[PDB]
Every structure is written in structure tokens, then in C-alpha cells.
Coordinates of C-alpha atoms and ligand atoms in Angstrom, one line a residue:
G1 CA 16.9 -13.9 1.9
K2 CA 20.7 -14.0 1.5
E3 CA 20.5 -10.5 0.0
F4 CA 18.8 -9.2 3.2
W5 CA 21.8 -9.9 5.4
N6 CA 24.2 -7.9 3.0
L7 CA 22.1 -4.7 3.1
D8 CA 22.7 -1.4 5.0
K9 CA 21.5 -1.4 8.6
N10 CA 18.9 1.4 8.0
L11 CA 17.4 -0.5 5.1
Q12 CA 17.2 -3.6 7.3
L13 CA 15.2 -1.6 9.9
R14 CA 12.9 -0.4 7.1
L15 CA 12.1 -4.1 6.3
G16 CA 11.7 -4.8 10.0
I17 CA 9.3 -1.9 10.5
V18 CA 7.2 -2.6 7.4
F19 CA 7.0 -6.3 8.4
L20 CA 5.7 -5.4 11.9
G21 CA 3.5 -2.7 10.5
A22 CA 1.9 -5.1 7.9
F23 CA 1.5 -7.9 10.5
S24 CA -0.4 -5.6 12.9
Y25 CA -2.4 -4.3 9.8
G26 CA -3.4 -7.9 9.0
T27 CA -4.5 -8.8 12.6
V28 CA -6.4 -5.6 13.6
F29 CA -7.0 -3.3 10.6
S30 CA -8.4 -5.9 8.1
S31 CA -11.4 -6.6 10.4
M32 CA -12.0 -2.9 11.7
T33 CA -15.0 -2.5 9.4
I34 CA -16.6 -5.5 11.2
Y35 CA -15.9 -3.6 14.5
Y36 CA -17.2 -0.2 13.2
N37 CA -20.3 -1.8 11.6
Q38 CA -21.1 -3.6 14.9
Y39 CA -21.0 -0.6 17.2
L40 CA -21.9 2.3 14.8
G41 CA -24.0 2.6 11.6
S42 CA -22.9 1.5 8.1
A43 CA -23.5 5.2 7.1
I44 CA -21.2 6.1 10.0
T45 CA -18.6 3.3 9.1
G46 CA -18.5 4.7 5.5
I47 CA -18.0 8.3 6.7
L48 CA -15.3 7.1 9.2
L49 CA -13.3 5.1 6.6
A50 CA -13.5 8.2 4.2
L51 CA -12.1 10.5 7.0
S52 CA -9.3 8.1 7.8
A53 CA -8.3 7.8 4.1
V54 CA -8.2 11.7 3.8
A55 CA -6.4 11.9 7.1
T56 CA -3.7 9.4 6.0
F57 CA -3.3 11.2 2.6
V58 CA -2.7 14.5 4.5
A59 CA -0.2 12.5 6.8
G60 CA 1.6 11.5 3.7
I61 CA 1.8 15.0 2.2
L62 CA 3.1 16.5 5.5
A63 CA 5.6 13.6 6.0
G64 CA 6.9 14.0 2.5
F65 CA 7.6 17.7 3.0
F66 CA 9.1 17.4 6.5
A67 CA 11.2 14.6 5.3
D68 CA 12.9 17.0 2.9
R69 CA 12.8 20.1 5.2
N70 CA 14.2 18.4 8.3
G71 CA 15.7 14.9 8.3
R72 CA 14.0 11.6 7.5
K73 CA 14.6 10.2 11.1
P74 CA 12.8 13.1 13.1
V75 CA 9.6 12.6 11.0
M76 CA 9.8 8.8 11.4
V77 CA 10.4 9.2 15.2
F78 CA 7.4 11.6 15.3
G79 CA 5.3 9.0 13.5
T80 CA 6.0 6.2 16.0
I81 CA 5.2 8.6 19.0
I82 CA 1.8 9.3 17.4
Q83 CA 1.3 5.5 16.9
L84 CA 2.1 4.9 20.6
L85 CA -0.5 7.5 21.7
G86 CA -3.0 6.0 19.3
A87 CA -2.3 2.4 20.3
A88 CA -2.4 3.1 24.0
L89 CA -5.6 5.1 23.7
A90 CA -7.2 2.4 21.6
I91 CA -6.2 -0.2 24.3
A92 CA -7.8 2.0 27.0
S93 CA -11.0 2.5 24.8
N94 CA -11.7 -1.2 24.3
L95 CA -11.8 -2.4 27.9
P96 CA -14.4 -5.2 28.1
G97 CA -17.7 -3.8 29.5
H98 CA -16.4 -0.3 28.8
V99 CA -15.9 -0.5 25.0
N100 CA -15.9 3.0 23.4
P101 CA -16.1 2.8 19.6
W102 CA -15.8 6.6 18.8
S103 CA -12.8 6.9 21.0
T104 CA -11.3 3.8 19.2
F105 CA -11.9 5.5 15.9
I106 CA -9.9 8.6 16.9
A107 CA -7.2 6.3 18.3
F108 CA -7.0 4.4 15.0
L109 CA -7.1 7.7 13.1
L110 CA -3.9 8.5 15.1
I111 CA -2.2 5.1 14.4
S112 CA -3.0 5.3 10.6
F113 CA -1.6 8.9 10.5
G114 CA 1.6 7.9 12.6
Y115 CA 2.1 4.9 10.3
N116 CA 2.0 6.9 7.1
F117 CA 4.7 9.2 8.5
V118 CA 7.0 6.2 9.1
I119 CA 6.0 4.9 5.6
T120 CA 6.3 8.2 3.6
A121 CA 9.7 9.1 5.2
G122 CA 10.8 5.4 5.1
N123 CA 10.2 5.5 1.3
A124 CA 12.5 8.6 1.0
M125 CA 15.1 6.8 3.1
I126 CA 15.0 3.7 0.9
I127 CA 16.2 5.9 -2.0
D128 CA 18.8 7.5 0.2
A129 CA 20.6 4.3 1.3
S130 CA 20.2 2.6 -2.1
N131 CA 22.2 2.6 -5.3
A132 CA 20.7 1.8 -8.8
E133 CA 22.1 -1.8 -8.5
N134 CA 20.4 -2.9 -5.2
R135 CA 17.3 -0.6 -5.4
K136 CA 15.0 -3.2 -7.0
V137 CA 16.2 -5.9 -4.5
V138 CA 15.1 -3.6 -1.6
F139 CA 11.7 -2.8 -3.2
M140 CA 10.9 -6.5 -3.7
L141 CA 12.2 -7.5 -0.3
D142 CA 9.9 -4.8 1.2
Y143 CA 6.9 -5.9 -1.0
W144 CA 7.6 -9.5 -0.1
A145 CA 7.9 -8.9 3.7
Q146 CA 4.6 -7.1 3.7
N147 CA 2.7 -9.9 1.9
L148 CA 4.1 -12.7 4.2
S149 CA 3.3 -10.6 7.3
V150 CA -0.2 -9.6 6.3
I151 CA -0.9 -13.4 5.9
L152 CA 0.6 -14.1 9.4
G153 CA -1.4 -11.1 10.7
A154 CA -4.7 -12.4 9.0
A155 CA -4.2 -16.0 10.6
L156 CA -3.7 -14.6 14.2
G157 CA -6.5 -12.1 13.4
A158 CA -9.2 -14.6 12.5
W159 CA -8.4 -16.7 15.7
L160 CA -8.4 -13.7 18.2
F161 CA -10.3 -10.7 16.7
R162 CA -13.8 -11.6 17.9
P163 CA -12.8 -13.3 21.2
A164 CA -9.7 -11.3 22.3
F165 CA -9.7 -7.9 20.6
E166 CA -7.6 -6.3 23.4
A167 CA -4.9 -9.0 23.0
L168 CA -4.3 -7.7 19.4
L169 CA -4.3 -4.1 20.6
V170 CA -1.7 -5.1 23.3
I171 CA 0.3 -6.7 20.6
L172 CA -0.1 -3.6 18.3
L173 CA 1.2 -1.4 21.1
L174 CA 4.1 -3.8 21.6
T175 CA 5.0 -3.8 17.9
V176 CA 4.8 0.1 17.9
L177 CA 7.3 0.1 20.8
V178 CA 9.8 -2.3 19.0
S179 CA 9.5 0.0 16.0
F180 CA 9.8 3.2 18.2
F181 CA 13.0 2.0 19.8
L182 CA 14.5 0.8 16.5
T183 CA 13.7 4.2 14.9
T184 CA 15.1 6.1 17.8
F185 CA 18.2 4.1 18.9
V186 CA 19.2 1.8 16.0
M187 CA 18.4 4.1 13.0
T188 CA 20.8 6.7 11.6
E189 CA 19.7 9.8 9.6
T190 CA 20.1 9.3 5.8
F191 CA 19.4 12.8 4.4
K192 CA 20.8 16.2 5.0
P193 CA 19.2 19.1 2.9
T194 CA 21.3 21.9 1.2
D195 CA 11.3 25.7 3.2
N196 CA 7.8 26.5 1.8
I197 CA 5.3 23.6 1.4
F198 CA 3.6 25.1 -1.7
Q199 CA 7.0 25.9 -3.2
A200 CA 8.2 22.3 -2.3
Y201 CA 5.3 20.7 -4.2
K202 CA 5.1 23.3 -7.0
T203 CA 8.6 22.1 -8.1
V204 CA 7.6 18.3 -8.1
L205 CA 4.3 19.1 -10.0
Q206 CA 6.3 21.2 -12.5
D207 CA 8.5 18.0 -13.2
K208 CA 6.6 17.0 -16.4
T209 CA 8.7 13.8 -16.9
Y210 CA 7.7 12.6 -13.4
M211 CA 4.1 13.8 -13.8
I212 CA 3.7 11.7 -17.0
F213 CA 5.0 8.7 -15.0
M214 CA 2.6 9.5 -12.2
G215 CA -0.3 9.5 -14.7
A216 CA 1.0 6.0 -16.0
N217 CA 1.4 4.8 -12.4
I218 CA -2.2 5.9 -11.5
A219 CA -3.6 3.9 -14.5
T220 CA -1.7 0.7 -13.5
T221 CA -2.6 1.2 -9.8
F222 CA -6.2 1.6 -11.2
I223 CA -6.2 -2.1 -12.0
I224 CA -5.2 -2.9 -8.4
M225 CA -8.1 -0.6 -7.3
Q226 CA -10.4 -3.2 -8.9
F227 CA -10.4 -5.3 -5.7
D228 CA -11.7 -2.2 -3.9
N229 CA -14.4 -1.2 -6.4
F230 CA -15.4 -3.7 -9.2
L231 CA -14.3 -7.3 -8.2
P232 CA -16.7 -7.4 -5.2
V233 CA -19.7 -5.9 -7.2
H234 CA -19.0 -8.4 -9.9
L235 CA -18.8 -11.5 -7.6
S236 CA -21.6 -10.3 -5.2
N237 CA -23.8 -9.4 -8.2
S238 CA -23.1 -12.5 -10.4
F239 CA -20.9 -15.2 -8.9
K240 CA -22.1 -18.8 -9.4
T241 CA -21.9 -20.5 -5.9
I242 CA -19.7 -23.7 -5.8
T243 CA -20.3 -26.1 -2.9
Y244 CA -20.7 -16.8 -2.7
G245 CA -18.9 -13.9 -4.4
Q246 CA -17.7 -12.2 -1.2
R247 CA -16.3 -15.5 0.0
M248 CA -14.6 -16.1 -3.4
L249 CA -13.2 -12.5 -3.5
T250 CA -11.7 -13.3 0.0
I251 CA -10.0 -16.5 -1.5
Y252 CA -8.5 -14.4 -4.4
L253 CA -6.7 -12.1 -1.9
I254 CA -5.3 -15.0 0.1
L255 CA -4.3 -16.8 -3.2
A256 CA -2.5 -13.6 -4.5
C257 CA -0.6 -12.9 -1.2
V258 CA 0.4 -16.6 -1.0
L259 CA 1.6 -16.5 -4.7
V260 CA 3.7 -13.4 -4.0
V261 CA 5.3 -15.1 -0.9
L262 CA 6.1 -18.2 -3.0
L263 CA 6.9 -17.0 -6.6
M264 CA 8.8 -13.8 -5.7
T265 CA 12.4 -15.2 -6.0
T266 CA 11.4 -17.5 -9.0
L267 CA 9.8 -14.8 -11.1
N268 CA 12.7 -12.5 -10.1
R269 CA 15.2 -15.1 -11.4
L270 CA 13.5 -14.8 -14.9
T271 CA 13.3 -11.0 -14.7
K272 CA 16.8 -10.4 -13.0
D273 CA 18.3 -8.2 -15.7
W274 CA 15.0 -6.8 -17.3
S275 CA 14.6 -3.0 -17.8
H276 CA 12.1 -1.2 -15.5
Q277 CA 10.3 0.1 -18.7
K278 CA 9.8 -3.7 -19.6
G279 CA 8.8 -5.0 -16.1
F280 CA 6.2 -2.3 -15.8
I281 CA 4.7 -3.2 -19.2
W282 CA 4.8 -7.1 -18.6
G283 CA 3.4 -6.7 -15.1
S284 CA 0.8 -4.1 -16.1
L285 CA -0.1 -6.4 -19.1
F286 CA -0.8 -9.5 -17.0
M287 CA -2.5 -7.4 -14.2
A288 CA -4.9 -6.0 -16.8
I289 CA -5.4 -9.4 -18.6
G290 CA -5.9 -11.2 -15.2
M291 CA -8.7 -8.7 -14.2
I292 CA -10.3 -8.8 -17.6
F293 CA -10.5 -12.7 -17.5
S294 CA -12.0 -12.5 -14.0
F295 CA -14.6 -9.9 -15.1
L296 CA -15.7 -11.9 -18.1
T297 CA -15.9 -15.2 -16.2
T298 CA -18.4 -16.4 -13.4
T299 CA -16.9 -19.9 -12.6
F300 CA -14.3 -21.0 -10.0
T301 CA -11.7 -22.8 -12.2
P302 CA -11.2 -19.8 -14.7
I303 CA -11.3 -17.1 -12.0
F304 CA -8.7 -19.0 -9.9
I305 CA -6.4 -19.3 -12.9
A306 CA -7.2 -15.7 -13.9
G307 CA -6.0 -14.7 -10.4
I308 CA -2.8 -16.6 -10.9
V309 CA -2.1 -14.5 -14.1
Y310 CA -2.8 -11.2 -12.3
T311 CA -0.5 -12.1 -9.4
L312 CA 2.2 -13.0 -12.1
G313 CA 1.9 -9.4 -13.4
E314 CA 1.7 -7.7 -10.0
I315 CA 4.9 -9.5 -8.8
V316 CA 7.0 -8.1 -11.8
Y317 CA 5.2 -4.7 -11.9
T318 CA 5.5 -3.7 -8.2
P319 CA 9.3 -3.6 -7.9
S320 CA 9.9 -2.3 -11.5
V321 CA 7.5 0.8 -11.1
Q322 CA 8.9 1.5 -7.5
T323 CA 12.5 1.7 -9.0
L324 CA 11.5 3.7 -12.1
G325 CA 10.0 6.4 -9.8
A326 CA 13.2 6.6 -7.7
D327 CA 15.3 7.1 -10.9
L328 CA 12.9 9.9 -12.1
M329 CA 13.1 11.5 -8.6
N330 CA 15.2 14.6 -7.8
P331 CA 17.8 13.6 -5.1
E332 CA 17.2 16.8 -3.1
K333 CA 13.4 16.6 -3.2
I334 CA 12.9 12.8 -2.7
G335 CA 10.5 13.5 0.3
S336 CA 8.2 15.8 -1.7
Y337 CA 8.2 13.3 -4.7
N338 CA 7.0 10.5 -2.3
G339 CA 4.4 12.9 -0.9
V340 CA 3.1 13.5 -4.6
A341 CA 3.1 9.7 -5.0
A342 CA 0.4 9.4 -2.3
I343 CA -2.2 10.9 -4.8
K344 CA -1.9 7.7 -7.0
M345 CA -4.1 5.5 -4.6
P346 CA -7.0 8.0 -4.0
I347 CA -7.3 9.0 -7.7
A348 CA -7.0 5.4 -9.0
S349 CA -9.6 4.4 -6.3
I350 CA -12.0 7.3 -7.1
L351 CA -11.9 6.6 -10.8
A352 CA -12.4 2.9 -10.3
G353 CA -15.3 3.6 -8.0
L354 CA -16.8 6.3 -10.4
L355 CA -16.4 3.6 -13.2
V356 CA -18.3 1.1 -11.0
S357 CA -21.3 3.6 -10.8
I358 CA -21.8 3.1 -14.6
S359 CA -20.9 -0.7 -14.3
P360 CA -24.6 -1.9 -14.7
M361 CA -25.1 0.1 -18.0
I362 CA -21.8 -1.0 -19.7
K363 CA -21.6 -4.5 -18.0
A364 CA -18.5 -6.8 -17.6
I365 CA -17.6 -6.8 -21.3
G366 CA -18.0 -3.0 -21.4
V367 CA -16.0 -2.4 -18.1
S368 CA -13.1 -4.6 -19.4
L369 CA -12.8 -2.4 -22.6
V370 CA -12.3 0.7 -20.3
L371 CA -9.6 -1.3 -18.3
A372 CA -7.8 -2.5 -21.5
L373 CA -8.0 1.0 -23.1
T374 CA -6.6 2.7 -19.9
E375 CA -3.9 0.0 -19.5
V376 CA -2.9 0.9 -23.2
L377 CA -2.7 4.5 -22.0
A378 CA -0.4 3.4 -19.1
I379 CA 1.9 1.8 -21.7
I380 CA 2.0 5.0 -23.8
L381 CA 2.7 7.3 -20.8
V382 CA 5.5 5.0 -19.4
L383 CA 7.3 5.0 -22.8
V384 CA 6.9 8.9 -23.0
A385 CA 8.3 9.3 -19.4
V386 CA 11.1 6.7 -19.8
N387 CA 12.1 8.3 -23.1
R388 CA 12.3 11.9 -21.7
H389 CA 14.2 10.7 -18.6
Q390 CA 16.7 8.5 -20.8
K391 CA 18.0 11.8 -22.4
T392 CA 19.1 13.0 -18.9
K393 CA 21.7 10.0 -18.7
Ligands
XP4_401 C1 2.0 -0.3 13.3 C2 0.7 -0.7 12.8 C3 0.1 0.1 11.6 C4 -1.0 -0.7 10.9 C5 -1.3 -0.2 9.5 C6 -2.2 1.0 9.4 C7 -2.7 1.2 8.0 C8 -3.8 2.3 7.9 C9 -4.4 2.3 6.6 C10 -5.7 3.1 6.6 C11 -5.6 4.4 5.9 C12 -5.0 4.3 4.5 O1 -5.6 4.7 3.5 O2 -3.8 3.9 4.5 C13 -3.0 4.4 3.4 C14 -1.7 3.6 3.1 C15 -1.4 3.8 1.7 O3 0.1 3.9 1.5 P1 0.8 3.2 0.3 O4 0.2 1.7 0.3 O5 0.4 3.9 -0.9 O6 2.3 3.2 0.6 O7 -1.9 2.1 3.2 C16 -0.8 1.4 3.3 O8 0.3 1.8 3.6 C17 -1.1 -0.1 3.0 C18 -1.6 -0.9 4.2 C19 -0.8 -2.1 4.5 C20 -0.6 -3.1 3.4 C21 -0.4 -4.6 3.8 C22 0.0 -5.5 2.6 C23 -0.7 -5.2 1.3
XP4_402 C1 -19.5 5.6 25.2 C2 -20.2 6.2 24.0 C3 -19.4 7.3 23.3 C4 -19.4 8.6 24.1 C5 -18.7 9.7 23.3 C6 -17.2 9.6 23.2 C7 -16.6 10.5 22.1 C8 -15.7 11.6 22.5 C9 -14.2 11.4 22.3 C10 -13.5 10.7 23.4 C11 -13.7 11.2 24.8 C12 -13.2 10.3 25.9 C13 -14.2 9.2 26.2 C14 -13.5 7.9 26.7 O1 -14.0 7.2 27.5 O2 -12.5 7.6 25.9 C15 -11.1 7.6 26.4 C16 -10.6 6.7 27.5 C17 -11.4 5.5 27.8 O3 -12.1 5.5 29.0 P1 -12.4 4.1 29.8 O4 -12.5 3.0 28.6 O5 -11.2 3.8 30.6 O6 -13.7 4.1 30.5 O7 -10.4 7.6 28.7 C18 -9.4 8.5 28.7 O8 -8.4 8.3 28.1 C19 -9.9 9.8 29.4 C20 -10.5 9.6 30.7 C21 -10.3 10.8 31.7 C22 -11.1 12.1 31.5 C23 -12.6 11.9 31.4 C24 -13.1 11.8 29.9 C25 -14.3 11.0 29.7 C26 -14.1 9.5 30.0 C27 -15.3 8.6 29.7 C28 -16.5 8.7 30.8 C29 -16.2 8.0 32.1 C30 -16.5 6.5 32.1 C31 -16.4 5.9 33.5
LMU403 C1 -5.0 -11.7 3.3 C2 -4.8 -10.3 2.7 C3 -5.9 -9.4 3.0 C4 -5.7 -7.9 2.5 C5 -4.5 -7.8 1.7 C6 -4.1 -6.4 1.3 C7 -5.0 -5.2 1.7 C8 -4.1 -4.0 1.3 C9 -4.5 -2.6 1.6 C10 -5.9 -2.3 2.1 O1 -5.9 -0.8 2.2 C11 -7.2 -0.2 2.5 O2 -7.7 -0.7 3.7 C12 -8.8 0.2 4.1 C13 -9.6 -0.7 5.0 O3 -11.0 -0.7 4.8 C14 -9.4 1.1 3.0 O4 -10.4 2.0 3.6 C15 -11.8 1.8 3.1 O5 -12.4 3.1 2.9 C16 -12.0 3.7 1.6 C17 -12.6 5.1 1.5 O6 -13.5 5.3 0.4 C18 -12.4 2.8 0.4 O7 -12.0 3.4 -0.8 C19 -11.7 1.5 0.6 O8 -12.1 0.6 -0.5 C20 -12.1 0.8 1.9 O9 -11.5 -0.4 2.1 C21 -8.1 2.0 3.0 O10 -8.1 3.3 2.5 C22 -7.0 1.2 2.4 O11 -5.9 2.0 2.9
LMU404 C1 -0.9 -20.0 7.5 C2 -1.4 -19.7 6.1 C3 -2.6 -18.8 6.1 C4 -3.0 -18.5 4.7 C5 -4.2 -17.5 4.6 C6 -4.8 -17.2 6.0 C7 -5.9 -16.1 5.8 C8 -6.6 -15.8 7.1 C9 -7.7 -14.7 7.0 C10 -7.8 -14.2 5.6 C11 -8.9 -13.1 5.5 C12 -9.1 -12.7 4.0 O1 -10.2 -11.8 3.8 C13 -10.6 -11.1 5.0 O2 -9.7 -10.0 5.1 C14 -9.6 -9.2 3.9 C15 -8.6 -8.1 4.1 O3 -9.1 -6.8 4.1 C16 -11.0 -8.5 3.6 O4 -11.0 -7.8 2.3 C17 -11.7 -6.5 2.6 O5 -10.7 -5.4 2.6 C18 -10.0 -5.4 1.3 C19 -8.9 -4.3 1.4 O6 -9.1 -3.2 0.4 C20 -11.1 -5.0 0.2 O7 -10.5 -4.9 -1.1 C21 -12.2 -6.1 0.2 O8 -13.1 -5.8 -0.8 C22 -12.8 -6.2 1.6 O9 -13.8 -7.1 1.5 C23 -12.0 -9.7 3.4 O10 -13.3 -9.2 3.2 C24 -12.0 -10.5 4.7 O11 -12.9 -11.5 4.7
HT1_405 C1 -11.9 11.2 -0.4 C2 -10.6 10.4 -0.3 O1 -10.9 9.1 -0.9 C3 -9.9 8.2 -1.0 C4 -10.4 7.0 -1.5 C5 -9.6 5.9 -1.5 C6 -8.3 5.9 -0.9 C7 -7.5 4.7 -0.9 N1 -6.3 4.6 -0.4 C8 -5.9 3.2 -0.6 C9 -4.7 2.6 -0.3 C10 -4.6 1.2 -0.6 C11 -5.6 0.6 -1.3 C12 -5.4 -0.8 -1.7 N2 -6.4 -1.6 -2.1 C13 -5.8 -2.9 -2.4 C14 -6.4 -4.1 -2.8 C15 -5.6 -5.2 -3.0 C16 -4.2 -5.1 -2.8 N3 -3.4 -6.2 -3.0 C17 -2.0 -6.2 -2.5 C18 -1.5 -7.6 -2.3 N4 -1.6 -8.4 -3.5 C19 -1.1 -9.7 -3.3 C20 -3.0 -8.5 -3.9 C21 -3.6 -7.1 -4.1 C22 -3.6 -3.9 -2.5 C23 -4.5 -2.8 -2.3 N5 -4.2 -1.5 -1.8 C24 -6.8 1.2 -1.5 C25 -6.9 2.6 -1.2 N6 -7.9 3.5 -1.4 C26 -7.8 7.1 -0.4 C27 -8.6 8.2 -0.4

């Protein structure tokens, strides 16, 4: 909190923008599958969400490059303009009595795209206006702001999603505006280069030390991808109802976000002068242990505790990995590096989903072995990467 007021103006805007972004995500985007399922098929909803994910990954790659090629600010400003167009069109597509789902999909496809521009470039900018001393503070403040805001979003969302959709859309447009003005007027450019998209990425992919870290990061973000692919299947398939797996899985998310909001500062106090190599390993250890405990148990009391363990790990892990990457990052090609960092979520997700296809054969005990084993791999790759980088001092 006190740290926030002593930061660079640009970084403060970054926190503001992500706050608003996450809030609006919570309220509207969390419940968009409900919307799509209602108006379109579940075959359609699945195809739609697949396209949006591919769309946003491509947004991230383009934003990463253009953040390096031109400045960070133009890209960010472009993103907000895209968002305005999407938000306005989504408002006009959801008029009561004249609700157009397909139009709303396209509008939301725009908003997601526009948002990842502001995110991808914003990440590059975080590195630009940060020094090695305050970098971790920024990353955690970022991470904290998002969690608190997704909760506030979720609360308002539940109350008004079904009754007053348009109200949220109006609010979404208004948050986009706030963010747009901020990005245009208040924000100052942080990077001046001294290009070819393939050549821009070829260099980052040729960075073996970063690529190793990327592989480690994919394995630790693979554990997070559990909520997306194997925690629901587990609970829906075999959760003992207490006077409802999908309802329990929902609790877990709420619990975790609440725990981050509350224990951020506290757990940070204990980890204040830890190495990033350490934080990654302790975080990625508790995260794997928490998931394994959840997978092997089907009762409320153990799962709830198991969830507490995972969140302990996630809180430490998140800022530590985010700083480690920045240190391994080339100062001239930060944008391209953040672009490459987009691949961690789809790959970690695809593998977790692919793993879930074989879930019935191997079962919970079998699944956990694969998690533990891949987490051990993450530890190996982080040490390899940190070691190689340490030389470059
Ligand atoms: C202005 C309002 C904008 C509202 C948010 C739109 C988000 C659209 C998400 C749908 C497409 C998608 O796959 O998003 C990818 C993006 C991943 O980026 P990152 O989390 O790797 O930085 O996802 C994210 O950036 C994460 C989503 C928000 C997380 C909230 C807290 C956890
Ligand atoms: C309803 C089932 C789905 C049908 C297939 C839609 C998929 C195609 C992609 C989108 C094409 C535009 C359709 C549309 O209405 O969306 C945009 C928006 C909303 O119109 P409204 O909500 O004000 O009636 O209006 C605008 O922004 C553009 C309006 C001006 C030009 C006419 C274009 C068609 C408008 C819809 C038809 C007229 C309704 C009275
Ligand atoms: C209270 C807190 C509630 C939620 C807290 C945090 C949620 C964090 C991020 C959610 O992020 C996500 O939401 C979408 C909404 O369906 C996913 O989109 C969806 O389609 C993807 C395509 O196969 C699937 O792999 C995802 O599991 C699925 O959820 C997005 O790709 C992802 O970007
Ligand atoms: C004032 C204090 C308030 C404290 C908590 C308030 C919570 C208010 C609403 C919480 C809603 C939590 O859960 C509700 O949104 C979640 C966010 O995507 C959904 O979670 C859904 O999207 C997630 C994102 O990838 C997926 O991993 C889940 O598998 C999917 O089910 C839940 O399925 C939905 O039921
Ligand atoms: C063909 C292309 O296929 C693709 C497939 C998937 C994705 C994809 N992109 C994603 C981005 C984010 C997430 C995601 N899922 C999460 C589940 C939980 C959490 N939280 C964060 C908050 N803490 C407190 C609890 C855990 C974060 C999460 N982030 C999943 C995602 N899946 C992209 C392309």
C-alpha cells in the first residue's frame, strides 16, 4: 500500500489499468459462457471460446513485437481504441428485445484483443520503469490488485449479470474510457528502440537460457492449468456432496483469491529477501503439493486445507517467476520476450487438457505422479536457467 504511493507515475497507471481491467473481467467475462450457452449451442460456445483464445494469443504476439518496433504507449493506446469499439458495439448488440449474441461475440473478441495489447505492452513497460530492487514489489502489487478487483467484479457480477446485463456493459465501456484517457493523456512513453517480426522472434527463441526458463515456467503454470482441465473433472466425477463438485470448485477459486488479498503482505514479509530461484521452487512446491492433496482427497475439510497450501505456494511463486523472467530478458527486446511468454498459458493448458483425456485410465493417484514428476522437471529447468544467467553478472 505505502509502496504504491512511492512508485513512478507510469507504473501507478499500470496498476490502475489492470485493476479496472480485472474488475470488468470479473463482472462480465466470468459469466460469458452462461450467456453464450443460453443463446448459442454448447458446440458453438466451445468453438467460440477456442477462437477467442487463439485471437488473444495472436494479439499478444503482435503487441509484443510492435511494443519493441514502435513505442509501448502507441500499442497501448491502440489497444484501448479497439476496446472502446468492442465495448460500444457489445452495448448496442445487447439491447433488450433486440439481443444479438453473434454480434456480441465479435464485440467481445475485439475487447479481449484490445485488452491483451494493453497487457502485453504494459508488461514490457513494467520492466522499463522498474529497477531490480522494486521490480518484485510492482509484480506483487499488480498480482494483488487483480485478485482484489476480480472479487469485487464477481460480487457486482452475480447481482446484475442475469437482471441487468447492459448495466455491466455500460460500466465496461466507462472503465475502457477511464483507461483510454489515462493511457493517452497521463501516460508517458517508456521505451525508445535503437524491424522484421520473424527476425524479432527468432532472436528470443535462440535465447537458450530464457527458453529453458520458459520450459520451467510452462511446467509451473501447468499446475495452475489444473483448475481449467482436471480439478472440475475430479470434483464433478467424484466429489462427496456436503449439505456438488462444480459448486465446491467455485468455492476453491473464491477461497484462493481471498487468501491472496489477505496474506500477500504477510507472506511477503517472510519472503522479503528470498532469491527468485528460491521463491519459484517454494511456490511451485506448495502449488504442486496443494493440487496433489486435492486430487487424492474427496472430502471438504482436506480439500479446503489443500487449497490453502496451494494458495501459499502461488502467492510466493507468482512475483518470483515474473521477476526472474525480467532479469533473463534482453533490455532492447523486452516486448518480443513478453510476446514469447504468451505461449506458456496455451501449451500448459493443452498439455493439462491432453493429460485429462487419459485421466480415467491412470486415475487420481496416477495423475498426481505426472504432476509431481513434471514439477520436479520445473525445479531442474529453473536451476539450469538461473545457473547459466548467473554467469552473465
Ligand atoms: C477492460 C476489460 C477487459 C476484460 C478482460 C478480458 C480478458 C479476455 C480473456 C479471454 C481471452 C484470453 O485467453 O485471455 C488471455 C489473457 C492471458 O494473459 P496473461 O494472463 O497470460 O497475462 O488473460 C488474462 O490476461 C487474464 C484474465 C484476467 C485475470 C483476472 C484475475 C486472475
Ligand atoms: C439476430 C441473429 C443473428 C444474425 C446474424 C448476425 C451476425 C453478423 C455479424 C453482425 C452484423 C450486424 C448485426 C447487428 O444487429 O449487430 C450490430 C448492431 C446491433 O443492432 P441493434 O441491436 O441496434 O438492432 O448494429 C450495428 O452496429 C449496425 C447496424 C447498421 C447496419 C445494418 C446491419 C444489420 C443490423 C441488424 C438488422 C436490423 C435490425 C433492426
Ligand atoms: C472469483 C474468481 C473467479 C475467476 C478467477 C480467475 C480466472 C482467471 C483467468 C480465466 O482465464 C480464462 O477465462 C476464459 C473464460 O472461459 C478461458 O476460455 C475458455 O476457453 C479455453 C479454450 O479451450 C479453455 O481452455 C478455458 O479453460 C476456458 O475457460 C480463457 O482462455 C482464459 O483466458
Ligand atoms: C465481498 C466478498 C466477496 C467474496 C467472493 C464473492 C464471489 C462472487 C461470485 C464468485 C463466482 C465464482 O465462480 C463463478 O465464476 C468463476 C470464474 O470464472 C467460474 O469458474 C469458471 O471459469 C474458470 C476460469 O478458468 C474455470 O477455471 C472454471 O472451471 C469455470 O467453472 C465459476 O464456474 C463460476 O461459478
Ligand atoms: C488452440 C488454442 O488453445 C488455447 C487453450 C487455452 C488457452 C488459455 N489461455 C489462458 C489464460 C489464462 C488461464 C487461466 N486459468 C486459470 C485458473 C485459475 C487461476 N487462478 C488465479 C487466481 N488465483 C487466486 C487462483 C488461480 C488463473 C488462471 N488463468 C487459462 C488459459 N487457457 C489459450 C489457447
